[PDB]
Amino acid sequence: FQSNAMFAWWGRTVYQFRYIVIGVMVALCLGGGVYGISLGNHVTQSGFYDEGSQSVAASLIGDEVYGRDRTSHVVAILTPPDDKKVTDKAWQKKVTEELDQVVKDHEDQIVGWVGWLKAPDTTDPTVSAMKTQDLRHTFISIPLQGDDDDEILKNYQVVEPELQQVNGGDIRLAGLNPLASELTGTIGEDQKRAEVAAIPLVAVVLFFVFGTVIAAALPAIIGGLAIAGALGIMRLVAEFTPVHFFAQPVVTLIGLGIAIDYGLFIVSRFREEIAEGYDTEAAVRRTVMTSGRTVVFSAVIIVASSVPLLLFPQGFLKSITYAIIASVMLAAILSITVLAAALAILGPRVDALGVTTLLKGFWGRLVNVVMKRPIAFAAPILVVMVLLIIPLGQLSLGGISEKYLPPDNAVRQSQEQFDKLFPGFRTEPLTLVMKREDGEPITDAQIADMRAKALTVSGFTDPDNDPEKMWKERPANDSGSKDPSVRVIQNGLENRNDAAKKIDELRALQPPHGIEVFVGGTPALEQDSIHSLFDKLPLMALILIVTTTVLMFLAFGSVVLPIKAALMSALTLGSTMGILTWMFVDGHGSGLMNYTPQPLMAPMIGLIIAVIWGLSTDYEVFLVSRMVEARERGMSTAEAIRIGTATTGRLITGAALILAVVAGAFVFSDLVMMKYLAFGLLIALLLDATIIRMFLVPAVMKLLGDDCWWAPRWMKRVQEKEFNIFEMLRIDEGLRLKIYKDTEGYYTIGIGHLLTKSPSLNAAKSELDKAIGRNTNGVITKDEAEKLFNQDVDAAVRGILRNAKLKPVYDSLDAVRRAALINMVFQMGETGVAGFTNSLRMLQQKRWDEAAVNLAKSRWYNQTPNRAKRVITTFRTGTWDAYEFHLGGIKAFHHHHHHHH
C-alpha cells in the first residue's frame, strides 16, 4: 500500500539531516516544557456534568437569578479550649473578632462568615441548630468570592492558612472547598511520588532490557521530552478550552511510560540491526521503517481509542483525551525523529558504556510448548476471564464525595464530623427552575400550580410535614439578578437512590401554560451525567472497535488477526473491569490500599475503557507485528508465532514493567478515581503481558494456522518484486536498451554486455542483431536485456565452477551472496576475484564481518567504493538491502567480464 513507501524515505532523511532534526525537536520539546510548567495554574476542576443537560441549564439559570449557593463553600467547626463551652461570651468575642479580621483582610476572597456565633441570642431554630446541645461545638459558614469553581477554590486556598489559625488552631474546615482543595491536591503529590519512586525503577528496568546505559538512557530521555512537549501542548490548549486537573497526571501516567515503550522498541531494533552487519545509515532506515510502522500505528491506535471519548459531554473527558493524544502522538513523533537521529549519530556507540560508569531460549521454548497443546491452555484461560466478568454486574455509579479521599484524611473527617455533629444542614435538593419564555413575572398562583403538581410526586422529604411548606423557594442572595421571570422551588429527597425515577417524573409533569421547567440539583446533575454516559457508550464502543481493528488490519495485512485482537482486547477489558468492581465496589483490597468501597464516577468508566482498550491493542501490535514480519519473511505459522514471541519477549516484559512501575506509583493516590484508573492499567497490563502475550495469543494463532494470516481481500496487499541478481547489477552496471560506448570506448548494451571492440557501430549492430536473432538497429527491450544478462551470468557461474579457487566459496554461499560474488566476477574477472584468497576463505567459513572488513581494505574498494560497499554489505548481511535502497545512480558504465555470445 501507500504506507510502506514513506517510512523508507523518512529513514534515509533522518540520517541525512541528523543534527538539524535533533536540534529543532529538542528545542521545541524543551521550549514546550518551559512553556508547560505553568500548566497547573490554568487548570480546572469542573467538567463532571453534562453541559447540555437540563440540570446544568437549571443550575445556570438558578445561579443567575437567585445567586449561586455559597452556603456550603466553607464550613468551620469551632471548639472552645479547656472544656469551655460555646456560650462563653469571652470566647465568643475573641473568636468572632479573629473571624472579622480574616474577612476584613480578604474581602476579595471572602463574602463573610455566617453562623450562630454572629448572633448567639437568636430563637431562630435553624440558626440555633448551628451549635450542639452540649455547647462544646459550633460551626459557621464562610461563603467565598468568585464566579466559578476554580476562582472560589483559589480564594479558599488564600484564606485557609489564616482561617486555620482561628481559635488557636482549634478550628476544623470542611465543605465544598476544603474537600476540593484536598482532592485536587492529590495530583501534585501523585506526580512527586512518580518522580521519587517511578523514575529510578524505570531506569532499572530500562537497563535490565538492554545491556548498556546509553541504549538504556535514550528511551528515558524521549519520555521526558514527550512529557515536556505534551505539557506545553496542553498549556497551549488551555488558552482556547478548559483543561482539567486530571489531564496532568494522565500525561505522566500514560504518556511517559508509553513514550518509554515506543523508545524501547526503536533502540532495540537499531541495536538488532547493528548486530547484523548493517551500516549505521542502513540500521536507522530499517529500524525506522519497521519500528516506526509499529510505533506510529500504535500511537494512532491509541488516538483512535481516545477520540471516541469526545462523544461524551464531560469536559473532564475532553481534556484528558487531548492530553492522551498529545502525549502518545508526540511520543511516536519523538521516537522516530529525535531518537532515530540520535542513533544515527551514535551508531554502534550506543553500546559503549556498561554497568561500570560510576560518578555519584526461554521465550523460545515457552512459546512452542504452548503451541502443540494450545487448547489445553486456551480453554482454562477463557473460562476464568469470563468468570472475571461476573463481578461487573455489581458495578454502580455515583458523584464526587468526601469518600473519594482515604478514611484517615483529616479533611474527609472534618466533613464526616460536620455531618455527625450537625446532621441537618448538608442537603442536596432537587430544583424546579421555572422560566417563562414571556418576559413578565411569575404569579403566586402560578407557583401554586407547580407546587400542586410537585406535591403530587411521591417521595420528597417532609420534615415538618405540611405539604404547603414543602417545595420552599430557593434562597436568594445578593449575587442574583432576581428577575421575576424566573422562580425556583426545591425540596430534598426521601431515600436518594431513586432520584433518576423522581427526576424523570418531575419532567413529565406538565408545566403550567407558557413556562419551560428546568429540573436541577446535585443529584440531577449527577444523574444526567450518568445517563449521558450510558447513552453515548454503545456508540463509543462501536467507533472504538472499528477504528482500531481497521488500523491493526493496515498494520498487519491480516483480516483475521485484527478481529482476533478485538476479541482478545474485549475479554481483557471485561476481565479487568470485573476485578476493579471487585476491588472498588465490593471493596476487596480496600483495607490493604486504604480506600473506601463506593460507586465509581460515571465518566471514569468511559476513560478506563478507552485507555485499557488502546493499551491492550498496542501490546498486540508490539507482538504480532513481529510475527507478521516473520511470515512476510516467509515462515510457517508455527515458527512465525515463535519468532515474534522470542524477539519481543524480553522487550515487551520491559515495556510492560516500565509502564507497570509508573502505574504502581499512582495506585497509592489518595484520590479513588486515580487509584481506580491506575489499577486498571496494572491489571489490564499484567493480563496482557502474561496471560495474553505468552499463552492465549500463540495458542489461538496456531489454531488458525495460516488462516490467521491474511485471508480475504485478495490483492488487498500487493505482492512485490523480489529482488534479484539482474536488479542488483542493473544498479551497479546500468541498464541500457540502446547501443552505447562505455568508458573504454567500446560498444556496449544491456547490463554491461560488450558487443564488440570494433570501432564500427554497424559491426556492433551486426553482432547485436546476431545475438538477439533479430534486426535491432541498435535497440533492444528490457526482456532481451535480461535474456542477454542471464547468458552472461550463466557464463560467469560456469567459469566460477571450473575455478578451484572460486568454486568452494561459491558452493557454500546462499543465493544472495552468490550474486555478490558473481557481481565481483563481472567487474574484475575470475582471476581478479580469485586474488581475494583470504576474504573468500572468510566467506566460505561464513565469517561475514571479518570478510566485510577485509574486503574494504582492497584496492577494489578504493577505486570503486560505492559498488564495493554495496557488494560488501551484501556479503555481510546476506540481503538485497544495499541495493533496494541505493543512493542515486551511477555515471561511468563499464562492460563486465564474461560477455557470452
Ligand X SMILES: CCCCCCCCCCCCOC[C@H]1O[C@H](O[C@H]2O[C@H](CO)[C@@H](O)[C@H](O)[C@H]2O)[C@H](O)[C@@H](O)[C@@H]1O
Ligand Y SMILES: NC(=O)CN(CC(=O)O)CC(=O)O
- Where do breaks (C to N over 2.5 Å) occur in the chain, by preceding residue number? 360
Using CB under 6 A, pick the residue from 487, 894, 897, 899 that binds ligand Y: 894
Q: Does the protein bind ligand X through residue 60 (CB under 6 A)?
A: yes
Phi then psi for 461, rounded to 5 degrees? -60, 140
CB of 757 to ligand Y, least distance (A): 19
| Binding-residue pattern over the window 80 to 119 for ligand Y, x denoting contact by CB under 6 A | ----------------------------------------
User: Is residue 803 close enough to count as binding ligand Y by CB under 6 A?
Assistant: no
Cβ 731 to ligand Y, closest distance in Å?
8
239-298: contacts with ligand X (CB under 6 A): 240-241, 245-246
660 touches ligand X by CB under 6 A: yes
Q: Which grid coordinates are listed for 358?
A: 560510576
Please tell me the count of residues contacting ligand Y according to CB under 6 A: 17
Burial class of residue 408, CB neighbours in 10 A (0-12, 13-18, 19+): exposed
- The residue among 255 and 391 lying less far from ligand X, judged by its C-beta, is 255
Contact between 180 and ligand X (CB under 6 A)? Answer: yes
For the CB of residue 503, give the shortest distance to ligand X in the complex, in Å: 15
From candidates 11, 223, 232, 664, binder to ligand X by CB under 6 A: 664
- Regarding 392 and contact with ligand Y (CB under 6 A), the answer is no
Place of cell 554486455: 753
The distance of Cα 254 from the centroid of its chain, to the nearest Å, equals 6
Helix (H), strand (E) at residue 736: strand 736-741
- In the sheet that holds 736-741, the strands lie side by side as 736-741, 747-750, 753-756
* Distance (Å, whole) CA 867 – CA 262: 35
Distance of CA 704 to the CA centre of its chain: 30
Residues 6+ away with beta carbon under 8 Å from 735: 750, 751, 782, 785
Which residue stretches of 358-438 are H helix?
Answer: 362-371, 374-387, 410-421
Q: How far is the CB of 860 from ligand Y (least distance, A)?
A: 8
Q: What are the DSSP E strand ranges found in 476-576?
A: 486-491, 515-520
Binding residues for SQ109: 618
Answer yes or no: are the C-beta atoms of 608 and 677 closer than 8 Å.
yes
Residue 208 sits in the site that holds ligand X (CB under 6 A): no
By CB under 6 A, residue 193 contacts ligand X: yes
- For ligand X, the binding residues in 410-439 under the rule CB under 6 A are 425-426
Q: What are the C-alpha distances in Å from 557 to residues 304, 569, 712, 787?
A: 18, 19, 10, 35
For the annotated binding site, the residues are 45-49, 618
**What's the closest the beta carbon of residue 861 comes to ligand Y, in angstroms?**
8
Catalytic residue among 279, 732, 742, 792: 742
Alpha helices in 164-313 (DSSP H): 176-193, 199-209, 213-237, 247-250, 257-275, 280-306
- Report the nearest approach of ligand Y to the CB of residue 865 (Å): 5
Q: Which of 395, 856, 866, 885 binds ligand Y (CB under 6 A)?
A: 866
DSSP conformational letter for 144: B
Q: What number of residues does the chain have?
A: 901
Cβ nearer to ligand X, comparing 664 with 698: 664
Q: Which three cell numbers stand for residue 691?
A: 496471560
For residue 386, the one-letter residue type is V
Binding mask 124-163 for ligand X (x = CB under 6 A): --xx-------------x------xx--------------
Q: Could you say which of 50, 670, 732, 733 is catalytic?
A: 733
Among 618, 670, 732, 881, binds ligand Y (CB under 6 A): 732
Select the residue interacting with ligand X from 44, 54, 59, 298 (CB under 6 A). 59
Q: Is 853 in the site for ligand Y (CB under 6 A)?
A: no
239-242 long-range contacts, CB within 8 A, separation 24+: 239/42, 241/318, 241/319, 242/44, 242/46, 242/47, 242/315, 242/319
- 329 binding ligand X? (CB under 6 A): yes
Tell me if residue 733 is catalytic.
yes
The least distance separating ligand X from the CB of residue 264, rounded to whole angstroms, comes to 16
Residue nearest to ligand X (CB): 664
For the annotated catalytic residues, the residue numbers are 733, 742
Residue ranges that bind ligand Y, judged by CB under 6 A: 732, 835-839, 854, 858, 864-868, 890-892, 894
Residue ranges that bind ligand X, judged by CB under 6 A: 45, 49, 56, 59-60, 62-63, 68-69, 71-72, 75, 114, 118, 126-127, 141, 148-149, 175-176, 179-180, 183-184, 193, 197, 233, 237, 240-241, 245-246, 322, 325-326, 329-330, 400, 406, 425-426, 594, 660-661, 664-665, 668
